[PDB]
Structure formats: C-alpha cells, structure tokens
Design a protein around this ligand. Structure first.
Ligand SMILES: CCCCCCCCC[C@H]1C[C@@H]1C(=O)O
Ligand SMILES: CCCCCCCCC[C@H]1C[C@@H]1C(=O)O
Ligand SMILES: [Fe+3]
Ligand SMILES: [Fe+3]
Length: 222
C-alpha cells in the first residue's frame, strides 16, 4: 500500500500537494502576524505562532526537494485565493472572530486532518517532518479556541456567518485536490472524518452545544 515515491505519477501529484502545503504554511504565518494588528496585546504570542508556521514551511519545502519534486506554487496560490480573499475581507473590517475561525479553526483542522492522513503513507524523510509539525497544529487550534471561548457571548452570530461562508469553501478545496491526494494514497473519507472531528471538538471547547454545532452544519448545508 505504500506509494512508489520515485514514480512520475507520484511526483506529479506531489508537486501540487506539496505546493499547497508550502503556500498554506506561508499564508498561516501571514495570517497570525495580521491578527496582531487586531489584537495588539497578543503580538508576542502571535509572532511565536507565525515563527512556527515558517519552520513548518521550511520543513515541507525540504520534503519536496528530498523527492526531487519542483513545487507548483502558481497552482497553490490559486487554490488558496478564495479563502485568502475572505480572510482579507474580515481583516479589513476588523472582524477578529472571523479571522480566527478561518485560520485558527478551519485551516488548522484542515492541516491536522491532512497531516494525520499523510503520515502513514509518507516517505521516511517526510514522515519525521510531518510528525514534528502535528503538536504545533494543536497549539494553534488551542490559541483560537481559547480566544473564541473567552469572547463567545459577543460573537455567536458572526461565527455562524463565518462558518456558513467558509466551511463550504473548505469542502470545495478538498474536492479540487482529492485526485492528487488519492495518488498519494490518502483517502478523501478519512480526510473528511478527521477534519470534522477536529472542528467539532474545537466548537465544543469554545462553548457551542450539540444543537448549536448542528445549526452550524445546517447553515453550511443551506
Ligand atoms: C488533500 C491534502 C491537501 C493538503 C492541505 C494542507 C493545507 C495546509 C495547512 C497549513 C496552513 C495550515 C497551518 O499550517 O496552520
Ligand atoms: C479536509 C476536509 C474538508 C471537508 C470538510 C467539509 C465538511 C462539509 C460540511 C458541509 C459544508 C459542506 C457543504 O456541503 O457545502
Ligand atoms: Fe503550520
Ligand atoms: Fe498552524
């Protein structure tokens, strides 16, 4: 079941998935620095999280070089453009809860699910790097959960709306790269299950009850 990491078929799919990961890590660095403009008293903790994202970017860049793959960065920039646009719109409006739901909840849960699914089908070099990034993703999820938990009563409506707009985008993003992910021996159903578990757990921690979490699923489905 392990892929042939040397095949042209594998390298071609890896060129796009690796580019998406590298671009995602860079955008995550930029997103945490940007949140510092909304939360000036959190600048030092946000700088620490952003520095972790740059370490992740460096490690994943090394994964592609190790396999002799040239990352398709243009494809990766286009892939993230709709979610990037929604983050920038919220940032411009000073909508800290939306920025945090996009980056610290949705994007971190997408990273955790992708990395968890990739680990068992990864080459030995990339496996160690990916295992070494996972604890940081939980730190990032925890940062977003803690702020949203502390501020839940002022932003329930905004979070429902951020979810309605951005959760279907994450679903479309998975559909776009499910083909390449299957070449990497990653199952779309496992990617979805892990993402939903992480996202449900974050919403529970923040303070949403079962009905409210189901309302968020209903809003995204409508
Ligand atoms: C189907 C597998 C596609 C891989 C998607 C990976 C998205 C990158 C997630 C990184 C930006 C998140 C972070 O570092 O917090
Ligand atoms: C990596 C996993 C990304 C897919 C998770 C998205 C869950 C789908 C939930 C409802 C909002 C989707 C829709 O039908 O538009
Ligand atoms: Fe990261
Ligand atoms: Fe992260």
């Amino acid at each position: 079941a392990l892929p042939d990491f040397t095949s042209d078929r594998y390298k071609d799919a890896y060129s796009r998935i690796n580019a998406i990961v590298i671009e995602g890590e860079q955008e995550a660095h930029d997103n945490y620095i940007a949140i510092g403009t909304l939360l000036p008293d959190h600048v030092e903790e946000l700088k620490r999280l952003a520095k972790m994202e740059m370490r992740h970017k460096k490690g994943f860049t090394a994964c592609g070089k190790n396999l002799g793959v040239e990352a398709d960065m243009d494809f990766a920039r286009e892939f993230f453009a709709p979610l990037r646009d929604n983050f920038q719109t919220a940032l411009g409006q000073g909508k800290t809860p939306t920025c945090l739901l996009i980056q610290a909840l949705l994007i971190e849960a997408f990273a955790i699910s992708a990395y968890h699914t990739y680990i068992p089908v990864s080459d030995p070099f990339a496996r160690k790097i990916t295992e070494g990034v996972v604890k940081d993703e939980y730190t990032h999820l925890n940062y977003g959960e803690a702020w949203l938990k502390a501020n839940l009563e002022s932003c329930r409506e905004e979070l429902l709306e951020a979810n309605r707009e951005n959760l279907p985008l994450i679903r479309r993003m998975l559909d776009q790269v499910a083909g390449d992910a299957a070449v990497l021996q990653m199952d779309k159903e496992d990617l979805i299950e892990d993402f939903l578990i992480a996202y449900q757990e974050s919403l529970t921690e923040i303070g949403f009850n079962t009905r409210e979490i189901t309302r968020m699923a209903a809003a995204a489905l409508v």
